[PDB]
Amino acid sequence: SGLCSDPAITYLKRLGYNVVRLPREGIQPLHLLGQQRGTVEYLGSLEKLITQPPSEPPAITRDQAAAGINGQKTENLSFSIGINILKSVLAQFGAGAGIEAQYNQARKVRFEFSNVLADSVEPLAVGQFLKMAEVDADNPVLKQYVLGNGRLYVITQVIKSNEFTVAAEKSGGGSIQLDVPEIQKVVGGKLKVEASVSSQSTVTYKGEKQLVFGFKCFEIGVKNGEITLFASQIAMALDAAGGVMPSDSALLDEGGLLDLEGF
């Protein structure tokens, strides 16, 4: 935990998204998160709990444009903060190491979102699927979370992109000349590196994978005698709240960026 305040994070959390410290390809709707003693662990597929489905599963709608998130920018980040983000995002795209050496003149870097897509299930359909399941009485997820000391959440929506844009500045805001051919040689062929038509120092990195950088989830528990999906903040079942609002999804790291274990 800790405080990481940024306009881009604030916007995404207001939409209801957890924002992860480390964007990752493997984060999916209908996957489970286990929370115990602070730490959130990525558990994997909902079928670890629902070993025999009661019905067709909630359909996943894929690749919906998120035009409100597109164009969102972070603050102008001090190098120590911004370069660790750039390094780790490029690593997750499979880039070769060494991007920091190409940005050694940068005092500040700012990120811009583009090409953001959402994959989603309908939370109320997940809630129906959960409450109608016949879970085995000895199922390990049931016993450790639903009837145990952990807290379980199910992911209902992810936001992802295969690209991002970095603007860089020198001290005082001075323009910087970046060696784009060298940057390309550093990250390798799995990335396409291109400067902006209007700014030599603004560079877009495009990979071959979609990295999830935010997700919505809802807590699983027991109410009305059944396994229940809850609105966040009496504990209220999601299907009793009146629609599903941005504020109903659970934010697991309210102050900052969410760490995920299990990868």
- Largest Cα span, the chain: 64
Domain parsing of the chain, residue ranges: 7-248
Structure tokens at 233: 């903040």
User: Can you give the three-state secondary structure of the chain, one letter per residue?
Assistant: CCCCCCHHHHHHHHHCCEEEEEEECCCCCCEEEEEECCEEEEEEEHHHCCCCCCCCCCCCEEEEECCCCCCCECCCEEHHHHHHHHHHHHHHCCCCCCHHHHCCCCCEEEEEECCCEEEECCHHHHHHHHHHCCCCCCCHHHHHHHCCCCEEEEEEEEEEEEEEEEEEECHHHCCCCCCHHHHHHHHCCCEEEEEECCEEEEEEEEEEEEEEEEEEEEEEEEECCEEEEEECCCCEEHHHCCCCCHHHCCCCCCCCCECCECC
User: In this structure, are strands 117-120 and 18-24 parallel, antiparallel, or unpaired?
Assistant: unpaired
Q: At what resolution in Å was this solved?
A: 1.7
Residue 122 exposed, middle or buried by CB count within 10 Å (0-12, 13-18, 19+): middle
Task: List the determination method.
Answer: X-ray
CA dist 219 → 17, 28, 59, 75, 208 (Å): 14, 16, 20, 31, 32
- Give the phi and the psi of residue 211 in degrees, each rounded to 5: -95, 125
- The label of the residue with tokens 């690209």 reads 163
In angstroms, the CA 196 to CA 203 distance is: 6
In angstroms, the CA 150 to CA 182 distance is: 48
